[PDB]
Amino acid sequence: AKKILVTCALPYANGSIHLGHMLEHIQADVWVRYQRMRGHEVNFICADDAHGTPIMLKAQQLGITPEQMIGEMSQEHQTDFAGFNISYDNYHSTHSEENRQLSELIYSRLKENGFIKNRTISQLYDPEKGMFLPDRFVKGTCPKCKSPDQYGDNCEVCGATYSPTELIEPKSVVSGATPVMRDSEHFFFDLPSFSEMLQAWTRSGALQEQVANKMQEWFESGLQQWDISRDAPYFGFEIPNAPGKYFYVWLDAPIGYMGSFKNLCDKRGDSVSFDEYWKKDSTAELYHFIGKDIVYFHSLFWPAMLEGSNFRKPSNLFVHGYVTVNGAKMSKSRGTFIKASTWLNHFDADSLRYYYTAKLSSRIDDIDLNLEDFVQRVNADIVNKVVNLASRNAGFINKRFDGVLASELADPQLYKTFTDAAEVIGEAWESREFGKAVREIMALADLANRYVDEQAPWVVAKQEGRDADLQAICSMGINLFRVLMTYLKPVLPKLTERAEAFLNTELTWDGIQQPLLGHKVNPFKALYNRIDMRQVEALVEASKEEV
Ligand SMILES: CSCC[C@H](N)[PH](=O)O
Numbered sequence: 452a453k454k455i456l457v458t459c460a461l462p463y464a465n466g467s468i469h470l471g472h473m474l475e476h477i478q479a480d481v482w483v484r485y486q487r488m489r490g491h492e493v494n495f496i497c498a499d500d501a502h503g504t505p506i507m508l509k510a511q512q513l514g515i516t517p518e519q520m521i522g523e524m525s526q527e528h529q530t531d532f533a534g535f536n537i538s539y540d541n542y543h544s545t546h547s548e549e550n551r552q553l554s555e556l557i558y559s560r561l562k563e564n565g566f567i568k569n570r571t572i573s574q575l576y577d578p579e580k581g582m583f584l585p586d587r588f589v590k591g592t593c594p595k596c597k598s599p600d601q602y603g604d605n606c607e608v609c610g611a612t613y614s615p616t617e618l619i620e621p622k623s624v625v626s627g628a629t630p631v632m633r634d635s636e637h638f639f640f641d642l643p644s645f646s647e648m649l650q651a652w653t654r655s656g657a658l659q660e661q662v663a664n665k666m667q668e669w670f671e672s673g674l675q676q677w678d679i680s681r682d683a684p685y686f687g688f689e690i691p692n693a694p695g696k697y698f699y700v701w702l703d704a705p706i707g708y709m710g711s712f713k714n715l716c717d718k719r720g721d722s723v724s725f726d727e728y729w730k731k732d733s734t735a736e737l738y739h740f741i742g743k744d745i746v747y748f749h750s751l752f753w754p755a756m757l758e759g760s761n762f763r764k765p766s767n768l769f770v771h772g773y774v775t776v777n778g779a780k781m782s783k784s785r786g787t788f789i790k791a792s793t794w795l796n797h798f799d800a801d802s803l804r805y806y807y808t809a810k811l812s813s814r815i816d817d818i819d820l821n822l823e824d825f826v827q828r829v830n831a832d833i834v835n836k837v838v839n840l841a842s843r844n845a846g847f848i849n850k851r852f853d854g855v856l857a858s859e860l861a862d863p864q865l866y867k868t869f870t871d872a873a874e875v876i877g878e879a880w881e882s883r884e885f886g887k888a889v890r891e892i893m894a895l896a897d898l899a900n901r902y903v904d905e906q907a908p909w910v911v912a913k914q915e916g917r918d919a920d921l922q923a924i925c926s927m928g929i930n931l932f933r934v935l936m937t938y939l940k941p942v943l944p945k946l947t948e949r950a951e952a953f954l955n956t957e958l959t960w961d962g963i964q965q966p967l968l969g970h971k972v973n974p975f976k977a978l979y980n981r982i983d984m985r986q987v988e989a990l991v992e993a994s995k996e997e998v
Pocket residue numbers: 459460461462463500704705706745
């Protein structure tokens with residue numbers, strides 16, 4: 452059995468989970484559930500990204516400690532993910548003792564190895580509040596068009612871009628005082644030293660083609676040293692031997708992947724697995740599911756950091772595109788900027804899991820949630836192709852044959868056609884070609900419904916002396932359903948539980964090789980109901996009003 456550690460990017464603690472986040476967590480959860488079905492040792496890990504100036508300032512506005520605020524958001528996040536049944540083995544935080552010790556360890560090792568440099572820089576400073584200001588916390592009049600109240604390095608009127616130092620009449624967004632340039636010593640990570648190593652990895656053919664192409668652009672532009680320190684006031688980890696200096700959030704964030712796993716091991720009383728997974732000589736596999744906006748950190752800084760601190764590097768990076776709703780970026784004003792919590796007030800988790808999965812592929816292309824198509828696809832595929840296979844046959848079995856399935860398969864050849872597809876469908880789940888897996892599964896479902904139509908059980912049911920025939924027909928349809936739900940198990944956790952309760956059996960990948968014969972099934976209430984555009988409209992309206 453393989454030993455696999457899978458992660459999703461760590462959500463920032465200063466915002467609610469939305470449909471963008473869910474695309475990633477659902478993609479990874481489907482892959483993880485499939486890996487568990489094939490018998491491998493899997494560790495699905497995540498955590499909240501809880502450090503940084505934005506977080507520090509928000510807590511100060513709310514009138515509470517950053518600890519309290521991140522504690523509340525952590526609970527909010529986990530509640531939403533649980534509602535979508537994301538099966539984490541552990542959900543921790545970057546603000547923990549495990550991450551502190553690991554961040555300090557890696558830093559000391561990098562420093563000892565000569566990968567840390569000291570350098571003084573100039574930056575805007577709020578003399579009143581007594582803190583350096585990140586670009587987005589500086590505002591004034593645009594140098595070009597002279598438009599007042601512009602933020603950061605760009606103007607929202609003429610679209611011009613510039614250094615905040617070029618702003619006319621600058622003002623601290625925090626205190627309102629006029630900021631001034633001030634010097635400060637910073638610590639840098641020498642990424643350029645790992646150039647050749649990284650180019651080799653890019654060239655190995657492991658990463659996605661589109662990712663490798665993006666990386667060549669970055670090497671062409673040239674790698675630079677990375678500033679990894681921030682001055683107090685700051686909500687984060689203090690740098691050893693450097694009073695008033697802290698690790699920049701992006702330095703400790705990925706280490707959080709390690710901290711969450713150490714936390715899991717420690718809680719389990721397991722004293723050997725952390726090293727078995729992170730040591731240089733590991734035979735375990737490590738995968739990170741991430742979005743295209745953070746590929747630079749994960750494909751360049753991260754592998755380099757690990758190499759320089761004597762740890763293993765990622766086995767692979769699985770990148771996905773952005774989520775769009777009705778073809779465009781989520782829009783607050785149109786009500787398409789949807790929170791995960793809000794979605795669950797209107798629809799169930801399985802519906803979205805299925806829709807995203809049917810559109811996902813191994814490439815980094817954007818995924819579009821077309822609301823009109825969502826209603827049509829869910830009703831057509833889940834309700835009318837798969838669930839229909841059970842509902843149209845279970846009634847006769849429970850009422851005419853006391854819930855007992857036939858002693859033999861009515862059509863052995865057809866059943867073999869279904870089991871024969873396991874190899875290709877499983878390879879589809881394995882390679883992340885989710886769209887192909889769903890197409891193959893639904894094609895089988897069409898085959899199953901065609902079989903039922905050919906047999907016409909509603910006709911056989913009303914013809915004298917054909918009881919045995921009816922039971923055989925309906926049992927055959929139910930077994931085809933058994934197979935289909937097995938292939939879809941990684942996708943629809945809840946519908947799967949309802950199906951296993953009806954079938955009186957847990958669905959395992961290898962189990963399909965033994966059909967249910969002379970087997971008792973239970974009566975069942977609706978396994979899945981239809982949805983409609985009225986519900987979609989309510990979702991959009993609720994989302995409009997929430998912002
Ligand atoms: C180590 S992954 C960190 C990801 C950022 N918090 P954001 O959700 O891109």
